[PDB]
Structure 1
Amino acid sequence: TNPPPPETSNPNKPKRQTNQLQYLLRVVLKTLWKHQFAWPFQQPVDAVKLNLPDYYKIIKTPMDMGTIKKRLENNYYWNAQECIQDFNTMFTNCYIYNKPGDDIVLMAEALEKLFLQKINELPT
């Protein structure tokens, strides 16, 4: 079975929207979300549908852009670093589970390069 997905709201977690978090939603997430390689990353890994009995034995910190998008829309994060870390976790999980040269790894690397370009333009 699949684990429960990562939470996207938490009634006890303080909320904030800094100018950097605004940029992360309106520029960074939006740019990656519309990219041709976004589709594997727009929702949690469905280990049932993909028949991956070991995925959630290996990956204990799952993350995906659908979760990040909802977190940003909900003002779930306090700071930009929490959101940046979620993106980095998502890419890292792909690199852990898969192998060099797999199509999905090359897709993740292309999205990560674009992510890094856009993050370098974060407002100060």
Structure 2
Amino acid sequence: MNPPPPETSNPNKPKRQTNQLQYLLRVVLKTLWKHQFAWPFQQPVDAVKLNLPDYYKIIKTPMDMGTIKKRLENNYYWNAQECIQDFNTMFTNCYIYNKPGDDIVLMAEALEKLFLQKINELPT
């Protein structure tokens, strides 16, 4: 049931290491990574382990912080907005598949609040 994980290395993509991208890796992701509620988002959803054969039949653009981290470390992104879009996909996937008030949603919401606080001001 588990599809292959999203791509994290692509030598053909045009890469950059902007100040903003470095900050997203060194400050934003690494602080989120240590949050008490980070653990469900640190790797792709393992639908086999969770016995959720429906998950990837609903969520067609999966994303997780482990993937974002590998992408940042591989300079996969051209700008910070591309990386922020991946974070937003991760959060939105959770809000789509689950319902308001579910425990996993409360965890995603806590992470998102921290994420939005940290990216409110980015380097120049």
TM range, normalised to the smaller chain?
over 0.9
Q: Deviations over 1:72-91 (max 9, x none)?
A: 01111110011000000000
Q: Give the distance between the partners of 1:119 and 1:11, measured in 2 at CA.
A: 27
5+ residue gaps, structure 2: none
Q: Give the distance between the partners of 1:7 and 1:81, measured in 2 at CA.
A: 18
Q: Give the distance between the partners of 2:121 and 2:24, measured in 1 at CA.
A: 10
Deviation, 1:13, is 0.7
5+ residue gaps, structure 1: none
Deviation, 1:66, is 0.1
Q: Deviations over 1:27-86 (max 9, x none)?
A: 000110011000000000011111111101110000000000000011111100110000
| TM-score, with structure 2 as normaliser | 0.97
Q: Give the distance between the partners of 1:34 and 1:72, measured in 2 at CA.
A: 17
**Deviant stretches of 4+, over 4 Å:** none
Q: Deviations over 1:87-113 (max 9, x none)?
A: 000000000001111111001001000
Deviation, 1:121, is 2.0
| TM-score, with structure 1 as normaliser | 0.97
Query: In the alignment, which residue of structure 1 is the partner of 2:34?
Result: 34
Aligned length: 123
